[PDB]
Amino acid sequence: TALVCDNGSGLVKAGFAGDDAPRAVFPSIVGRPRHQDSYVGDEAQSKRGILTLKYPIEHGIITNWDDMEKIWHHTFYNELRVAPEEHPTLLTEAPLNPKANREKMTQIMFETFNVPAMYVAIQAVLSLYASGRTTGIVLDSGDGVTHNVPIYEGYALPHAIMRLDLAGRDLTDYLMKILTERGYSFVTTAEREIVRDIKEKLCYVALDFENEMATAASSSSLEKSYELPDGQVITIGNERFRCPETLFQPSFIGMESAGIHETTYNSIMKCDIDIRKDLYANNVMSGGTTMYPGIADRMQKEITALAPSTMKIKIIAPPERKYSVWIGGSILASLSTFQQMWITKQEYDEAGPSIVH
Ligand SMILES: Nc1ncnc2c1ncn2[C@@H]1O[C@H](COP(=O)(O)OP(=O)(O)OP(=O)(O)O)[C@@H](O)[C@H]1O
Numbered sequence: 001t002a003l004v005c006d007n008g009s010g011l012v013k014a015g016f017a018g019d020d021a022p023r024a025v026f027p028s029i030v031g032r033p034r035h036q037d038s039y040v041g042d043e044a045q046s047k048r049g050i051l052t053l054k055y056p057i058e059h060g061i062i063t064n065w066d067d068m069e070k071i072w073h074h075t076f077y078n079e080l081r082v083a084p085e086e087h088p089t090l091l092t093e094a095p096l097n098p099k100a101n102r103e104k105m106t107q108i109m110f111e112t113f114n115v116p117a118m119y120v121a122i123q124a125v126l127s128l129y130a131s132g133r134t135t136g137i138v139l140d141s142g143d144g145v146t147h148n149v150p151i152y153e154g155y156a157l158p159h160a161i162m163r164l165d166l167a168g169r170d171l172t173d174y175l176m177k178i179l180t181e182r183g184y185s186f187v188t189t190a191e192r193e194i195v196r197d198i199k200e201k202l203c204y205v206a207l208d209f210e211n212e213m214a215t216a217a218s219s220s221s222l223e224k225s226y227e228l229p230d231g232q233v234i235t236i237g238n239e240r241f242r243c244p245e246t247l248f249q250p251s252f253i254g255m256e257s258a259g260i261h262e263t264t265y266n267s268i269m270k271c272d273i274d275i276r277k278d279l280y281a282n283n284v285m286s287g288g289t290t291m292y293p294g295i296a297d298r299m300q301k302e303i304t305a306l307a308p309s310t311m312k313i314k315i316i317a318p319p320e321r322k323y324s325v326w327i328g329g330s331i332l333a334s335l336s337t338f339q340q341m342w343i344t345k346q347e348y349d350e351a352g353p354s355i356v357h
């Protein structure tokens with residue numbers, strides 16, 4: 001059985017190729033003693049009072065390799081309960097991942113974990129595959145980074161990839177700030193977990209932000225309430241949609257960047273004029289931060305406004321899209337026709353880490 005590990009900024013998704021969903025989903029966090037050994041994931045969070053917690057992946061890119069090794073170790077031995085030397089392992093990477101980073105991942109998998117075979121695929125490409133397509137443009141938005149990735153005949157078009165370092169954690173941070181200003185202090189890690197929950201449960205993307213603001217200003221009809229751990233009930237109205245509006249208006253958190261509708265359109269415009277029609281008709285949303293109710297309808301509206309008036313526009317937002325990258329990997333790695341595409345330990349021992357390219 002092959003393994004699929006999809007390492008994100010916020011969450012690890014791991015499991016077995018052929019399965020419908022990752023068996024293990026846990027925070028991409030490593031904790032080491034504050035005062036001198038390590039813990040990963042939920043247990044690191046539980047023992048946070050005695051540990052320094054770190055995220056080895058920053059906006060989709062591995063930046064702490066020693067801690068990343070702990071993530072992988074924990075994934076194999078504690079979460080999946082397998083011996084990595086017994087299983088071909090498919091890993092994922094961010095769009096525009098540096099060549100040296102892909103080489104380091106490869107070296108670690110073979111030399112440290114002794115996997116018999118491995119493969120590294122681009123996250124957004126796997127999401128496209130999970131939707132049954134080989135041509136389309138993916139918007140992948142997680143906890144740490146958002147990318148637009150146009151793909152033609154199975155391959156990403158790297159020149160046309162767009163990146164926004166604005167994603168779920170920034171949205172949680174903004175909601176924390178908003179609620180703190182209203183007099184409900186959310187600052188600590190325990191408090192961040194509460195606000196992340198409020199965000200996931202109550203936030204949504206307005207179809208027309210101005211109209212929605214007017215509605216919230218003139219009626220209680222958009223209000224929702226939420227009981228905090230201390231027993232206070234907080235009610236939110238316009239916070240529900242102001243928070244994810246930041247994706248379309250990055251200026252809400254002081255960023256001068258284009259919003260996700262603009263990055264989508266700009267990405268399509270970088271592509272060959274002769275494939276744009278196919279991209280417009282095959283916009284696939286991937287990742288946890290695309291889960292907001294209303295986001296597909298809003299994107300449809302915004303892309304329609306930017307594109308030629310005769311252009312057929314379609315946004316595809318699969319219900320399973322928290323796990324689309326992982327599912328794409330599960331499909332690819334279990335595919336009878338992919339079995340000759342693995343990099344084997346033998347090939348690695350002959351040629352070294354650069355074989356991965
Ligand atoms: N229902 C939801 N509504 C809004 N946000 C959600 C929802 N469910 C999950 N999220 C957010 O999705 C993010 C996690 O998604 P995902 O696993 O795709 O990211 P990742 O792979 O860890 O990060 P990245 O891809 O940025 O490196 C978190 O910010 C989480 O709060």
Ligand SMILES: [Ca+2]
Binds near residue numbers: 007008009123142325
């Ligand atoms: Ca991801």
